[PDB]
């Protein structure tokens, strides 16, 4: 909506003004801390609808984090148990539980897909269909004190993003009013301007950014004015915001050539990860910590996974001691990290949800104690 | 003897068995108050006591999870309470409705200021800092977020070329003592966290997390027990990986005035939020409504606010010239009070509340200012 300025478009897409069209589905599979955080954030934020899928039931080493399990929920399964308490979050957004298998036809039916307690392969597997079919892809994990946050909005997305300018000679009091000047263009249409100085109509200068439809060379259409003040020459404008085709790499594909975004090292976390996931589907458990072996074990992967890299990734000297961080605290499952991390991870949701606004460049990495 | 890496995951909640010293303050039941409880209370402190005079508004809702439709004109922290009190079965919860005097302050470790007027968080934080109460301040507008941290002038931490030292001996015992004769071993002090490399025999050390040092002599110090270690044969290296220092915080009101920000300490925007929030105070004050999202007569005037603000600010603050786009987004912006950054601001004042606790580890240095954009 050409009334719907830039910085209002923000809180909307934010999930401010709840009661707006809300247009895509959102599946949230795992139901251990981080996912019930990320799952309570989006439907607070009233995204159209919400599925809750896990396969696991309700363990001790789940309790801890999970605000909606207790101790008489032991042995059932989390999605289940989840959803009730879930559901009742806010009146309009429906919220469904799912047992099975993710499956391609099921995860077909969503806009969005967020990634929680999921083996790599699983990751893999389903990253690649969500790229291939569309689906907006979103992966976030806690390691004791360190997080990981992944991001594929597909290899495509119009993301704004920021400068030339012009010198209004006239604007109408129309709907959509229509500005004009001399000898401006390059605007286009998607752009979000800015103005100053414009007399008679004073109400456009401090004005939020607005959305801009080019006509031609010397006009281009703003936001609606017929309930404003009548014009006067004066007035010059700019340009804040431009649209831009962002291409986001399928997570089979990022996670050897990964685009990095407050931790001092990522691409160690990167690789530091990476063999975490191969050591709990080895083990089939993390590494305990009060245990050096578990932690040499790990930095054997990490030297392993250092040396398969990409040039781009690999590091000519792994930090040996930041791997063995990861090792001793990975058992961890600490809620005001869930909270943090599950926090950015549902502006990533709603990012994906609606307004195209700049995602996460699909990896982020965060050290907590750093 | 928990080794080092152990003692962040215990400051984190990993163990709420363990026994809890501190207890809590969370003043304003509003979405980002009843985020950073829910942490506190799954963290494990000791004891959580809720504070909020203000009753349930329909703006609170979307946020605060725990307030519905039908809790509308309740106390915010008296609806809270009961649901938060079903999340650690260990942690005390109660709900105070009541002013913020010296005396309820002064039974507290900690006090967490959510929606709370500027004039009150510097009187409480005047307060807090008298009594060596750790203050913390959290606050959400719309997409900005803002973090403040008091920890007293008591404050010790650990942190970060490093210093080494060879190793003549280390005793198979509880705890187990090393022997340096290095030049390098005037460096190492007590509690200073030290690791080890090349360690022949006792080999279980070069694995280890780093752990803490007893000075006994000039030639000799106590690690962490290695009384099932196996023989010490030759050789190794003691590393010094972590430091104890003393930092002073500033009291809220100093800090306000000469601010040190982060994610510079771990370059103009923060301060220019810092202004932006502090005209938001005042413009808050005075209309007792904060900016209306369509209304540009409503940035303007905080623009104008916080042009004032600027040139009363010190060198540390004060721009030469403002950012006024940033002004007037915060005026649009003012009004809102979204989930997913409640969320996250209320995860990392959580961890400060933690830090305060149990801590020896780094608070945020004075203020951390956010927007909800990212690089």
Redesign the interface.
Known sequence: IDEG?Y??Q??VL???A?KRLQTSSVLVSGLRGLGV?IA???I???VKAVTLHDQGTAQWADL??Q?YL?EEDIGKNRAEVSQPRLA??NSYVPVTAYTGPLVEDFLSGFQVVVLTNTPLEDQLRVGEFCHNRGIKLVVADTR??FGQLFCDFGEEMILTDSPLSAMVSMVTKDNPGVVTCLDRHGFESGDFV?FSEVQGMV?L????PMEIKVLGPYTFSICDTSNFSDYIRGGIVSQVKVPKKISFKSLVASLAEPDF??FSRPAQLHIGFQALHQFCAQHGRPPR??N??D??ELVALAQAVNARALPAVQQNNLDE?LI??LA??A??????????????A??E??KACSGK??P?MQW?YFD???
């Open positions: 300025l910085s209002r923000l809180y934010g999930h401010e709840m955080e309570k954030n989006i607070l934020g009233g801890s984090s605000f207790r009742e979050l004791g004190l800015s109400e200068n401090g004005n939020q975004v407050k910590p009060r050096d072996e932690a040499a001691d063995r961080k001793y605290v058992a961890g499952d600490l809620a005001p990290i869930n909270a943090f991390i599950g926090g950015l549902a502006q949701v709603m606004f700049m996460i982020l907590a104690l750093e």
